Symmetry: C3
Subunit: 207 residues, 3 copies
Amino acid sequence: FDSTDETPASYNLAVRRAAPAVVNVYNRGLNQLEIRTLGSGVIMDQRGYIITNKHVINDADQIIVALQDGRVFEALLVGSDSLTDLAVLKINATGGLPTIPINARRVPHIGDVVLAIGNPYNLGQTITQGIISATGRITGRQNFLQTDASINHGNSGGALVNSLGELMGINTLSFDKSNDGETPEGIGFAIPFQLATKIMDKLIRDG
Amino acid sequence: FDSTDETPASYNLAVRRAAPAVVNVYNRGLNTNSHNQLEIRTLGSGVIMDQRGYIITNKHVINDADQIIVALQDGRVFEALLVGSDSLTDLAVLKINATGGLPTIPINARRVPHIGDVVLAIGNPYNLGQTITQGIISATGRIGLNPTGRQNFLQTDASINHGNSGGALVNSLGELMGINTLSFDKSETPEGIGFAIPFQLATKIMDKLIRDGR
Amino acid sequence: FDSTDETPASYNLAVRRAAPAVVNVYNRGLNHNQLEIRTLGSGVIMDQRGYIITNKHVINDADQIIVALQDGRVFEALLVGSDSLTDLAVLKINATGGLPTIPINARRVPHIGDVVLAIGNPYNLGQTITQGIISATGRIGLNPTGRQNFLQTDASINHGNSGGALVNSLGELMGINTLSFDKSNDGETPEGIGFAIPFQLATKIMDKLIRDG
């Protein structure tokens, strides 16, 4: 057979659209100055506002944001919300920034293909693929999208997007509780994008 | 014109078709210590197979139950009766009595599962509530002797966890491929290796248990 | 609804095209006159002459290398050469009937997000197909792999997969599966992080081991 003109199944379109807006977040602390915790973040708009997780940036002497295009910025902590575990950062917007695609009218459905985008184990930006496993998941009263897109240490604060590259949520947690000394597989949680956007707005207002 | 109709890649169709028929199964035993109150000892999943209210699950999920509870995704909850079980295949059949119509799992008796088929695993891992995971059919059985000790397991890498047992593995059309039963969990932690009873064998065993109870 | 006429989404085409060329590799050793399996992995038949790519770690210190095809044929393989720098090894089998070979499209450029299937023999369960995507196609800066040209994938890779094939939805070879990531930060288990040698490099290193050693 000759598959030369056949086209490989791919979610590269979503990657080209969304990945440039997902950044590596470095929590640096005085050693000189070294990296304590690392995670990911999402550039939400041209103003330079970034969503990440609170646990990623906690007790940082200096927060660094690294874009996939090679630019590195010092980020300022705008605010954080312990109820939802989100935090907002702010970098220099001058020079133009890639932003995450957002479709405010898209309703996430169970079974939708999703890609997780982040920096696990500081390997560099990593794309993994799963589906929305459940919606409306939760002491705690939180609302999560559940996904089996592989999520690891470093993915926190990163993006979960669909095949169109639209933001579905912010990856936050990985289930690791074991009844029988066995390990959970493919159970991860993200803050739905609508909730995250709301929390970001409040935090920016400082209210 | 300003709002176009591009839609994300999705297996939601399979979910809408199959998921309503997959139930959360609760094995409950009475406790001598606290007022003879019923409490959960094991939990798993099950599949509603026909309108009469017959349900497939794993035998090890319902072993030694004082009370078996079945919860549907629409919010209905029923007490189920054990119709029978088969230890050779680890399958069990339950029966509920419902007034309204019951959702049933799509079954295409002529569909032949193929290695590489997209599948969804549907169940209630860790009692988080119904969960859908996605993988493919990794294998449709084995000719040679192997560590499973069996020759007819569907192997899949759709993530399966504690609580998924008794639940459904379906294709992208929502058609039943198998009943999720095992996970390879200890060796190095294995990843993406799970096993289901093929739907053909599960249907034959069910009919047998409904007819005889053995 | 009546789905009898609908077609299930499937990568079975890729499977039928690529899987027959992926073999089970057995590293046998003496421990008495009787030989025992010491290590097991996978391999990929690259051309009709019987040259097979595998991982060097799989075949190191072997007293006898055995290659099993999915069609039931079993051969003793000869170690043609190994390259420590890339952890690749080349084997050679001598066969009469004609051999299945892995599809290779030299002009295909792997892209991040591409659907891929890993094909190998994890835990000696038998040939296993798992599905993921290309998570990354190399690295620009220094990173924990120490290398700059790994394909990274979340297609589930397990012990026994090393030396096996990573192909796209068309059955075209993308890489040779080599590493899976198990380094934990604080007790957690890494999930869906695996690595493969890109097919272009694998081809080149094979050609050089064949003629030189």
